[PDB]
């Protein structure tokens with residue numbers, strides 16, 4: 001039936017700024033929040049302010065040296081850490097900005113607090129739109145991500161769950177999460193992503209895990225222009241087979257919105273309904289679920305996507321006519337919640353989609 005949803009948000013998150021021209025805009029988290037408050041969704045869910053995750057929490061995965069560096073680096077002392085910045089991949093994609101560590105602490109705090117709430121059986125779903133920073137590595141920042149809140153939240157779930165399923169619908173491969181759990185069967189990682197001349201360059205369908213983790217990493221490489229019809233026809237069958245074979249007791253779903261049509265960095269053609277169908281599919285399995293954010297660089301569409309996905313989590317129908325909100329002008333010229341796909345060609349032929357699905361099904365038979 002309808003589920004209890006706990007949602008995490010810190011009113012300060014929108015003020016962190018990656019710098020002029022940087023596509024990552026934490027302000028999109030505040031737009032999302034303001035839009036869902038204006039739809040009245042706060043009447044149906046418990047809203048929590050995450051704590052600032054500590055160094056003890058972050059070093060459950062990250063090295064002590066990398067966390068010490070993130071805690072120390074500031075725009076005023078950057079000149080003294082030139083060597084350390086290179087070592088930890090802090091620079092152009094992952095800049096040093098005022099309050100960087102606190103931004104990591106809030107992003108991580110929401111994901112870890114949500115996993116604790118799920119472990120305690122105090123909620124059916126936990127939502128942290130400021131989380132989902134799937135590229136961060138044990139001792140390195142990558143692709144706008146510094147602390148891997150997902151790996152930390154999964155480690156928390158593993159205290160009570162023998163098997164955890166991670167699903168990543170961001171247009172980019174979930175490499176940091178896959179890497180962390182590559183050699184274990186206690187976490188199965190499933191990523192759908194654009195593959196070929198695209199960041200991070202990993203996620204080939206032939207990357208299936210190693211050692212005890214062999215067959216516990218699943219990658220669905222896609223080409224430009226995938227649409228709702230093509231995505232929907234492979235997502236439900238793959239996730240259904242994974243659920244059947246793997247039998248997880250908890251799920252983490254990274255909802256990166258850069259897989260939507262019109263994304264500044266993405267080249268897919270999904271609508272908000274097509275992206276949210278992934279949430280609907282995962283919800284039907286009735287397992288404790290942690291829903292996280294991720295990419296999304298056309299910020300009006302990120303706010304629409306995550307507002308609608310929160311409504312889906314709540315089984316709450318919301319009107320297409322957008323309510324007035326603090327960012328109303330960002331949603332012009334239509335002022336509607338739902339988006340239209342573009343006329344871009346879908347390079348993912350139906351035969352290509354079926355063939356990759358069949359190749360992944362062969363790997364799932366090995367569980």
Ligand SMILES: CCC(O)(O)CCCCC[C@H](NC(=O)C1CN(C)C1)c1ncc(-c2cc3ccccc3nc2OC)[nH]1
Nearest residue numbers: 021022023092093133134143144170172199258294295296
């Ligand atoms: C949250 C989860 C997520 O998965 O959504 C993150 C996506 C991360 C994409 C990183 C990618 N980095 C690479 O290609 C690099 C180069 N090589 C050495 C690795 C990428 N694309 C686009 C950008 C990009 C980065 C910028 C940085 C500063 C200013 C403008 C910028 N303008 C940009 O683009 C207009 N940088």
Ligand SMILES: [Ca+2]
Nearest residue numbers: 168170172192
């Ligand atoms: Ca992905």
Ligand SMILES: [Ca+2]
Nearest residue numbers: 181184187216
């Ligand atoms: Ca694994």
Ligand SMILES: [Zn+2]
Nearest residue numbers: 170172258295
């Ligand atoms: Zn992305």
